[PDB]
Amino acid sequence: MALFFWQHGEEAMAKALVACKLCKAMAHEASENDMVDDISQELNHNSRD
Amino acid sequence: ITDDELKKVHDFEEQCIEEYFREKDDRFNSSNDERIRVTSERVENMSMRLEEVNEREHSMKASLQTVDIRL
Amino acid sequence: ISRLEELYNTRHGPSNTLYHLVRDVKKREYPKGNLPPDYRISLIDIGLVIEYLMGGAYRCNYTRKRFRTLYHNLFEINHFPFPFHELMVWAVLMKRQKMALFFWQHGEEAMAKALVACKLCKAMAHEASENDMVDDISQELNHNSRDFGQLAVELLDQSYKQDEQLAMKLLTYELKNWSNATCLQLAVAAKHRDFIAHTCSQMLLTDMWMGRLRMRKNSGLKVILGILLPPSILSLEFKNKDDMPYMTQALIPLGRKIYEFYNAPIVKFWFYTLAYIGYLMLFNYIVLVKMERWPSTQEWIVISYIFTLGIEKMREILMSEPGKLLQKVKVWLQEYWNVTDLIAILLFSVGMILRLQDQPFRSDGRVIYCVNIIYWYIRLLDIFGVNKYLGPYVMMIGKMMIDMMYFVIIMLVVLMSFGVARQAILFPNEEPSWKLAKNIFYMPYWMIYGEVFADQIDPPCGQNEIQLPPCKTGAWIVPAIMACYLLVANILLVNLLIAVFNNTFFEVKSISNQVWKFQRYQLIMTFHERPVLPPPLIIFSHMTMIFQHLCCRWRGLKLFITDDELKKVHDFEEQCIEEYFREKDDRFNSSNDERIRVTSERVENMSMRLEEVNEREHSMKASLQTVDIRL
Amino acid sequence: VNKYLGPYVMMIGKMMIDMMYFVIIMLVVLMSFGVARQAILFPNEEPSWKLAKNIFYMPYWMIYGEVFADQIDPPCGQNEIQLPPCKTGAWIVPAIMACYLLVANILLVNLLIAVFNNTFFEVKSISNQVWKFQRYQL
Ligand SMILES: CC(C)CCC[C@@H](C)[C@H]1CC[C@H]2[C@@H]3CC=C4C[C@@H](OC(=O)CCC(=O)O)CC[C@]4(C)[C@H]3CC[C@]12C
Ligand SMILES: CC(C)CCC[C@@H](C)[C@H]1CC[C@H]2[C@@H]3CC=C4C[C@@H](OC(=O)CCC(=O)O)CC[C@]4(C)[C@H]3CC[C@]12C
Ligand SMILES: CC(C)CCC[C@@H](C)[C@H]1CC[C@H]2[C@@H]3CC=C4C[C@@H](OC(=O)CCC(=O)O)CC[C@]4(C)[C@H]3CC[C@]12C
Ligand SMILES: CC(C)CCC[C@@H](C)[C@H]1CC[C@H]2[C@@H]3CC=C4C[C@@H](OC(=O)CCC(=O)O)CC[C@]4(C)[C@H]3CC[C@]12C
Ligand SMILES: CC(C)CCC[C@@H](C)[C@H]1CC[C@H]2[C@@H]3CC=C4C[C@@H](OC(=O)CCC(=O)O)CC[C@]4(C)[C@H]3CC[C@]12C
Ligand SMILES: CC(C)CCC[C@@H](C)[C@H]1CC[C@H]2[C@@H]3CC=C4C[C@@H](OC(=O)CCC(=O)O)CC[C@]4(C)[C@H]3CC[C@]12C
Ligand SMILES: CC(C)CCC[C@@H](C)[C@H]1CC[C@H]2[C@@H]3CC=C4C[C@@H](OC(=O)CCC(=O)O)CC[C@]4(C)[C@H]3CC[C@]12C
Ligand SMILES: CC(C)CCC[C@@H](C)[C@H]1CC[C@H]2[C@@H]3CC=C4C[C@@H](OC(=O)CCC(=O)O)CC[C@]4(C)[C@H]3CC[C@]12C
Ligand SMILES: CC(C)CCC[C@@H](C)[C@H]1CC[C@H]2[C@@H]3CC=C4C[C@@H](OC(=O)CCC(=O)O)CC[C@]4(C)[C@H]3CC[C@]12C
Ligand SMILES: CC(C)CCC[C@@H](C)[C@H]1CC[C@H]2[C@@H]3CC=C4C[C@@H](OC(=O)CCC(=O)O)CC[C@]4(C)[C@H]3CC[C@]12C
Ligand SMILES: CC(C)CCC[C@@H](C)[C@H]1CC[C@H]2[C@@H]3CC=C4C[C@@H](OC(=O)CCC(=O)O)CC[C@]4(C)[C@H]3CC[C@]12C
Ligand SMILES: CCC1(c2ccccc2)C(=O)NCNC1=O
């Protein structure tokens, strides 16, 4: 859904960089709060995408 | 930058998004794996339509032989 | 039973090494010898064969008293409840790989069957290499072991993909048809390194490590703060009462919190580590400071540590897997650290007995203490082996010693040649004395490490400065051969060992990572079975257990799941097998090679049918032309 | 700020973490040889803080080409001026010296050479990207 919404609308570069920041931040927060490690890996993958 | 240049960079960003998406589509359509898959499938269908063509050609040959026998 | 005995006694099909295994277990059981040619191999002997190959405390269902009673009374009671299991074992034993792979797909408990097959294949490969058979048989058996291991790894991947918790239940549940074992225990008994180093089993081992503590964030430090400060335990977050209870045998909240904390294996390990570090500094204090006639309080604490640790090592020997004590010792000798610990305990006992006497034996006991202090420092590498960076480093050093040994041998040859040449030129009138070997080995060995002994390279002699003693004949060869020795030592051999250590780095690093991830299980289950109290206070837990044993005489961390959950894990295991097989079929059908081949063929046929179509179209065109000419 | 020296400093920064484990194993082996040598060669010492200095002093300089050749195997228990008598078990002091000098100078340093070389390429690429990243911060 995020990749679909990235295509539509303006300011796609800032939207992509903000999404990469948010994904890395929630990956770090999920690793810090002792959640499932697969969630942190998938959030890091979304940040890299 | 101003509203005018904002409109310009928004147009630039949309051209960049369309060019990137359809260049990815061109790369995917020209890869060896997708070409082999599309071919394989196309070939699969061909044979099936040509087997139908062979059966209908046998029927047409039998009809032509019967018409030649009648006349 | 009779049909399976006839299957085990067949002579058709490919060759096998089963007869050698039956001969070896018959020679071991009744020390006879070679079997008669007309020998009918009973399934009891197959049971002993399975027990010998699987090793440890494995007890095949054939050798149990129920099956021997059924055998004595008969040679649906004679029908096997799980026939695919015995068929699988039959196939794996007589080296029919495709039949075993077919029987792996059909039936339940496919994971335990695959791990047992990998164990059996590796064991017969080792036995075929030991008995000097054909090496191709050993290679093919190792290939079959690796194929069954890859099957189990892919099944584990599918179980982790579908549902996590029921996959843990698959990994932990007791296998009644496999000597009451566990899939994890079978993956460790078969030395399956890829199975244990998988991320699911690693986090299972991490969950097993932490006991009943949630924690998992900056771990180790809060464990140490709980150890050193007993009122720091109540601030730690504790897991639920029923969230993952791995056990072996299936006010008050404060006492439950204390009991759950102090029985956690990480807390028990850090207890043992702090007690060990305290013992090491108490050993340092008694060896640096002078020793009186009687031992001090610190020496008494060190002696108490050594002897309680010795009784604890004897406890690890007695509470082991086999039933016969020689096999218990043979199992315990696999861990080399335990053997060197026992040797160090005996050496400290000899040193203490020599120290408690008078001179000149007290100094000898002090010296034996000073040699033991070296090993008790070196044991900190195994203590640090629990770390995810230091453990593989220690394993890597272990691999690198074997590469160093050949350098040591070539080094010894060149060093001994230069030592013999220098001592035999510069000293031409010596007498038979043991100082000649010391003069051979002394100077060249320190020549390696930056000390060339510059005062004695080419000393000025045969001149008056005080008159120097005359020159020994041929002494000028002593510098020149020195030059050669210093080159081959310092620029050739050390640089070659640098290249050896660097080129064997990557493979040894990956193997050290997998072996550390494998022996994490061994660390966890050894430290779960250990008593709560540290080694200096372990005598209390030991008398406690001795009194409990006497009271009982007067009167694997599994899950022990039920028939219902057994049905659930069997359904899960069948979904995993079907998903893995048809995902392999999807991968094979979507590969480029198979698509190109299927196309090529389809095209081949097309042309042939279209050539027939062209000929029939020519015939139809001729018929239409004739019909148009007629009308 | 330089395009050659900056990644070199970042690379040294990465290499310190690889050095730390060598330092730990080095500390264990060095402390064992220091305790053994001080506790054999000095059997009548008193509680004093010089014992730790004698533990840490000689083995650490033994790593860097100074084996202290005058004090490896000093001649004693003989008349030359009469030398003081031999300490008991002093012949173990050279032999364990041999082992310590091997594991220090041919095993551990060569292993750290291999560690630094095998982690060179990835750390070099990461140092290049981190330098190019922190150019903005500069
Ligand atoms: C679990 C680990 C990380 C910490 C626990 C170990 C320390 C608390 C121990 C180990 C060595 C001990 C020392 C060993 C020897 C001595 C000499 C001892 O002095 C004497 O016996 C003579 C002088 C006097 O009686 O005061 C005083 C205690 C002290 C410093 C000890 C203090 C406590 C130490 C530091
Ligand atoms: C279990 C061990 C390995 C680690 C935990 C540390 C403490 C529980 C122990 C170990 C060393 C012990 C010390 C060793 C030596 C001494 C010297 C001792 O001094 C005397 O006995 C001198 C006076 C006299 O002669 O009566 C007093 C106890 C003390 C400080 C001990 C206090 C308790 C310590 C710190
Ligand atoms: C103070 C002087 C005498 C120097 C002491 C040198 C040796 C007594 C030490 C130094 C480094 C040690 C090695 C460091 C690493 C390892 C790997 C480790 O091996 C394993 O973990 C595999 C064995 C197993 O656990 O089954 C322990 C043995 C070994 C070779 C050690 C053997 C003893 C060594 C050679
Ligand atoms: C990598 C390979 C080639 C290493 C091989 C070296 C060792 C076999 C040599 C090198 C230095 C030798 C030691 C040098 C000096 C001594 C002291 C010597 O002590 C005595 O003779 C007692 C009286 C005295 O000290 O004068 C006993 C032999 C020993 C330990 C030697 C034993 C053999 C050693 C360890
Ligand atoms: C070929 C390589 C692999 C090994 C070479 C080993 C040498 C270093 C050994 C083997 C024979 C040894 C000799 C065999 C016999 C003796 C007599 C022995 O005489 C005594 O002990 C007499 C009483 C005394 O003075 O103690 C002194 C050592 C010596 C010269 C040995 C010195 C060391 C030698 C030359
Ligand atoms: C694979 C490598 C590491 C094996 C190396 C083995 C040998 C090279 C070592 C092991 C035992 C050593 C011996 C142990 C004890 C002695 C007694 C020592 O005797 C003296 O020094 C006599 C007193 C004196 O006059 O100094 C001479 C060296 C020698 C033969 C050593 C020579 C070197 C030896 C044969
Ligand atoms: C890797 C390359 C660069 C090595 C080249 C080094 C050699 C060519 C040199 C280094 C040390 C030299 C030796 C140093 C000392 C002497 C003793 C010297 O003896 C005498 O003059 C006899 C009387 C006396 O000893 O005073 C004869 C030459 C020689 C063997 C030299 C020969 C040439 C050597 C072997
Ligand atoms: C004169 C004697 C006391 C020797 C001095 C040794 C140390 C004080 C120096 C020598 C090399 C230095 C290191 C060289 C390179 C780096 C990388 C550099 O790290 C970074 O750029 C990352 C940190 C950041 O900027 O966020 C600065 C720290 C460090 C580890 C340095 C830390 C301090 C070290 C160990
Ligand atoms: C890679 C790892 C294993 C390195 C570990 C080595 C250090 C922990 C050691 C090695 C040399 C030691 C030093 C050697 C000598 C001294 C002088 C000493 O000074 C005094 O005692 C003052 C009076 C005097 O100088 O006599 C104080 C300790 C110190 C700095 C020592 C502190 C600890 C050091 C730095
Ligand atoms: C196990 C490894 C990781 C660490 C080992 C550390 C040792 C090198 C330490 C720990 C205990 C220390 C001892 C603890 C107590 C004392 C008493 C202390 O006595 C005094 O200070 C008395 C007054 C004076 O003479 O200054 C002298 C140092 C000493 C022997 C310490 C020397 C250094 C020791 C052996
Ligand atoms: C990861 C690595 C680098 C950590 C290394 C830490 C220790 C090995 C160092 C850090 C602080 C050092 C201590 C700092 C100061 C001293 C006092 C010093 O005291 C004296 O020399 C007393 C005066 C004299 O009689 O010489 C003895 C060494 C010692 C204990 C040092 C021993 C080595 C220590 C414990
Ligand atoms: C002596 C070392 C140790 C130990 C401690 C921590 C980790 C591993 C081993 C112990 O203190 N007692 C039981 N077993 C042992 O060998």
Coordinates of N, CA and C in Angstrom, one line a residue, chain B residues 7-63:
Chain B
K7 N 6.0 24.1 -8.9 CA 5.3 23.5 -10.0 C 6.3 22.8 -10.9
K8 N 7.4 23.5 -11.2 CA 8.5 22.9 -12.1 C 9.1 21.6 -11.5
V9 N 9.4 21.7 -10.2 CA 10.1 20.5 -9.6 C 9.1 19.4 -9.4
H10 N 7.8 19.7 -9.2 CA 6.8 18.7 -9.2 C 6.6 18.0 -10.5
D11 N 6.6 18.7 -11.6 CA 6.6 18.1 -13.0 C 7.8 17.3 -13.2
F12 N 9.0 17.8 -12.8 CA 10.3 17.0 -12.9 C 10.2 15.7 -12.1
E13 N 9.6 15.7 -10.9 CA 9.5 14.6 -10.1 C 8.5 13.6 -10.6
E14 N 7.4 14.0 -11.3 CA 6.5 13.1 -12.0 C 7.1 12.5 -13.2
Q15 N 7.9 13.3 -14.0 CA 8.6 12.7 -15.1 C 9.6 11.6 -14.7
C16 N 10.3 11.9 -13.6 CA 11.2 10.9 -13.0 C 10.6 9.7 -12.6
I17 N 9.4 9.8 -12.0 CA 8.7 8.6 -11.5 C 8.1 7.8 -12.7
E18 N 7.6 8.4 -13.7 CA 7.1 7.7 -14.9 C 8.2 7.0 -15.6
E19 N 9.3 7.8 -15.8 CA 10.5 7.2 -16.5 C 11.1 6.0 -15.8
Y20 N 11.2 6.1 -14.4 CA 11.8 5.0 -13.7 C 10.9 3.8 -13.7
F21 N 9.5 4.0 -13.6 CA 8.6 2.9 -13.6 C 8.6 2.2 -14.9
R22 N 8.5 2.9 -16.0 CA 8.4 2.3 -17.3 C 9.8 1.8 -17.8
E23 N 10.9 2.4 -17.3 CA 12.2 1.8 -17.6 C 12.4 0.4 -16.8
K24 N 11.8 0.3 -15.6 CA 11.8 -1.0 -15.0 C 10.9 -2.0 -15.7
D25 N 9.8 -1.5 -16.3 CA 9.0 -2.4 -17.1 C 9.7 -2.8 -18.4
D26 N 10.5 -1.9 -19.0 CA 11.3 -2.3 -20.2 C 12.4 -3.3 -19.8
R27 N 13.0 -3.1 -18.6 CA 14.0 -4.0 -18.2 C 13.4 -5.4 -17.9
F28 N 12.2 -5.4 -17.3 CA 11.6 -6.7 -17.0 C 11.1 -7.4 -18.2
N29 N 10.6 -6.6 -19.2 CA 10.1 -7.3 -20.4 C 11.2 -7.7 -21.3
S30 N 12.4 -7.2 -21.2 CA 13.5 -7.6 -22.1 C 14.5 -8.5 -21.4
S31 N 14.2 -9.0 -20.2 CA 15.1 -10.0 -19.5 C 14.9 -11.3 -20.2
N32 N 16.0 -12.1 -20.0 CA 16.0 -13.5 -20.6 C 14.9 -14.4 -20.0
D33 N 14.7 -14.3 -18.7 CA 13.8 -15.2 -18.0 C 12.4 -14.9 -18.4
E34 N 12.0 -13.6 -18.5 CA 10.6 -13.3 -18.9 C 10.4 -13.6 -20.3
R35 N 11.4 -13.4 -21.2 CA 11.2 -13.7 -22.6 C 11.1 -15.2 -22.8
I36 N 11.9 -16.0 -22.1 CA 11.8 -17.5 -22.1 C 10.4 -18.0 -21.6
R37 N 9.9 -17.4 -20.6 CA 8.6 -17.7 -20.0 C 7.5 -17.4 -21.0
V38 N 7.5 -16.2 -21.5 CA 6.4 -15.7 -22.4 C 6.4 -16.6 -23.7
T39 N 7.7 -16.9 -24.2 CA 7.8 -17.8 -25.3 C 7.2 -19.1 -24.9
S40 N 7.8 -19.8 -23.9 CA 7.3 -21.1 -23.5 C 5.8 -21.1 -23.6
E41 N 5.2 -20.1 -22.9 CA 3.7 -20.1 -22.9 C 3.2 -20.0 -24.3
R42 N 3.7 -19.0 -25.0 CA 3.1 -18.8 -26.3 C 3.2 -20.1 -27.1
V43 N 4.3 -20.8 -27.0 CA 4.5 -22.1 -27.7 C 3.4 -23.0 -27.2
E44 N 3.3 -23.1 -25.9 CA 2.3 -24.0 -25.4 C 1.0 -23.8 -26.1
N45 N 0.5 -22.6 -26.1 CA -0.8 -22.4 -26.7 C -0.7 -22.8 -28.2
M46 N 0.3 -22.3 -28.9 CA 0.3 -22.6 -30.3 C 0.0 -24.1 -30.6
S47 N 0.7 -25.0 -30.0 CA 0.5 -26.4 -30.3 C -1.0 -26.7 -30.1
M48 N -1.6 -26.2 -29.1 CA -3.0 -26.6 -28.8 C -4.0 -26.1 -29.9
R49 N -3.8 -24.9 -30.4 CA -4.5 -24.4 -31.5 C -4.2 -25.1 -32.8
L50 N -2.9 -25.5 -33.0 CA -2.6 -26.2 -34.2 C -3.1 -27.7 -34.2
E51 N -3.2 -28.3 -33.0 CA -3.8 -29.6 -32.9 C -5.3 -29.5 -33.3
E52 N -6.0 -28.4 -32.8 CA -7.3 -28.2 -33.3 C -7.4 -27.9 -34.8
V53 N -6.4 -27.2 -35.3 CA -6.3 -27.0 -36.8 C -6.1 -28.3 -37.5
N54 N -5.3 -29.2 -37.0 CA -5.1 -30.5 -37.6 C -6.4 -31.3 -37.6
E55 N -7.1 -31.3 -36.5 CA -8.4 -32.0 -36.5 C -9.4 -31.4 -37.4
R56 N -9.5 -30.1 -37.5 CA -10.4 -29.5 -38.4 C -10.0 -29.6 -39.9
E57 N -8.7 -29.7 -40.1 CA -8.2 -30.0 -41.5 C -8.5 -31.4 -41.9
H58 N -8.4 -32.4 -41.0 CA -8.9 -33.7 -41.3 C -10.4 -33.8 -41.6
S59 N -11.2 -33.0 -40.8 CA -12.6 -32.9 -41.1 C -12.9 -32.3 -42.5
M60 N -12.1 -31.2 -42.8 CA -12.3 -30.5 -44.1 C -11.8 -31.4 -45.2
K61 N -10.8 -32.2 -45.0 CA -10.3 -33.1 -46.1 C -11.3 -34.2 -46.3
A62 N -11.9 -34.7 -45.2 CA -13.0 -35.7 -45.4 C -14.2 -35.2 -46.1
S63 N -14.6 -33.9 -45.8 CA -15.7 -33.3 -46.4 C -15.4 -33.0 -47.9

